[PDB]
Amino acid sequence: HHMNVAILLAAGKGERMSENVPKQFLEIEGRMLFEYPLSTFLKSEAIDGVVIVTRREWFEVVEKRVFHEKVLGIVEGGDTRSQSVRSALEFLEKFSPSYVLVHDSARPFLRKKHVSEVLRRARETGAATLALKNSDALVRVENDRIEYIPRKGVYRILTPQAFSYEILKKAHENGGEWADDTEPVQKLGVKIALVEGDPLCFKVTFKEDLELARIIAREWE
């Protein structure tokens, strides 16, 4: 048996959204954003269990929307994404799960096929993430000039990301803060598998991102 557990990150504050309420708890088509990806995991046969990571003040709001035997616990997040990840790893330690899938709840439109593909792709290498080839010109702003960044081999890292539990754990053993989990895992000399995603995997990050999420949400269920 090789238990696969999914970690749903929903402890962030969504400061860049400029709303009262963290983005993951905004309603679209009558459900909170975090519910969309949650039920992809609950309907997914590749997923043996789920951990939802949120801030202490959101535990009840979550508890009252989630009744499913696959949910192993609601777990207190940290002040950062990486700390929220670590908090989940400590909770999962008692279960000794073989593989772990991590996903930003703010990417709500997660497909079944992506979950299973990233997990089997993590079986072979130890580490994998959904990703997307760049399709735009890319730039950096330096003191009122824009640098045009070279584009060959550039990819947006999405989530889900999936790892053998021991690898991801080993990578967080000494703390650290990163945007994602492939970065710390790679520091161990582990190759990161890229798995073709699509633009539905975008992260609701800014106020403008809501128009699009409502549009997909209308079609979803």
Added chain:
Amino acid sequence: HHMNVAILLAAGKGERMSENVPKQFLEIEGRMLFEYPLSTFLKSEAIDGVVIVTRREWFEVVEKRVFHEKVLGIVEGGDTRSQSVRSALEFLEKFSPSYVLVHDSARPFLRKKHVSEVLRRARETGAATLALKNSDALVRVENDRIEYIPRKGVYRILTPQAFSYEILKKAHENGGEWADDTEPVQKLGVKIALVEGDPLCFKVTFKEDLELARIIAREW
């Protein structure tokens, strides 16, 4: 001082879609992809004229789907985006527009808001583009080994991109090849106004993009 013309670029081959039909002419909800941005320009009061740049053998396909006076013409593109843009500039010499707005037809879901907002903001420096702040971890591949790009100040550059006519002309007049038109214009020492857009401005570039195009099309 005024006329604004949108240059709608539709002369690409879309070779990364791995179709046999360029993505601009793919049928979504009974309409070809170029029809969508086209109608935004047509329905838009900020736009006095439209030039459509396409490949010679697709001319009649484009003509057939033109139902409006506002379309000034159909120009034959070139083998690169830059060359296709230059093709249109030449055609427009006779129209003497004040500002030109250039837009990738493979970015189908353009809004009114952006067409006018991009043009307003092009007036201050003579150059502006729709842009989108990065919101993903970003990486570069280097032979079965990836590298993490620093994210500070990183934007995805979109279209529409609008310029004063004269300036764009000056940026292209010695030829050249670039992914967009802000880069050559900046080389002339012009500051580029970034205009905040949204993810609906994505460009249908890969096969995996079509589903999302279909979802949004159902709502137009």
